């Protein structure tokens, strides 16, 4: 999470967001909050990388909450 802010090359910014989802497969209902700020981030790459993360995290069995963040 610190990484996404700390580098200015925007490939890395994207990557960090994506990667969180795999870490947080236990958690299903914490993930829409962690990336709630990252949809409203101004940088196109942080935004890109939000969609993957939410996707990975709640894959399989739907969740209303996750979809609402992604709209």
């Amino acid at each position: 999470l610190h990484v996404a802010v700390s580098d200015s090359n925007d490939d890395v910014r994207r990557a960090a967001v994506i990667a969180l989802g795999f870490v947080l497969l236990r958690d299903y209902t914490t993930v829409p909050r962690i990336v709630q700020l990252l949809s409203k981030s101004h940088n196109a790459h942080v935004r890109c990388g939000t969609a993957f993360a939410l996707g990975i995290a709640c894959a399989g069995k739907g969740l209303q909450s996750a979809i609402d963040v992604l709209d």
Binding site: L1, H2, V5, S6, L24, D27, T30, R33, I34, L37
Partner: protein, 48 residues
């Protein structure tokens, strides 16, 4: 007690909220520096 052993796993979850709370301050600083940067460009255009 049952609630108490389920707790242990909940407390870890609250700790990631703790880490969100530390993360805001790091985002804040980045934006504030940058608001002044964004403004610098517009001063270039204001002048000659």
């Amino acid at each position: 007690s049952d609630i108490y052993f389920k707790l242990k796993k909940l407390e870890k979850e609250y700790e990631l909220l703790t880490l969100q709370e530390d993360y805001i301050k790091d985002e804040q600083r980045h934006l504030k520096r940058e608001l002044k940067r964004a403004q610098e460009e517009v001063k270039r255009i204001q002048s000659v």
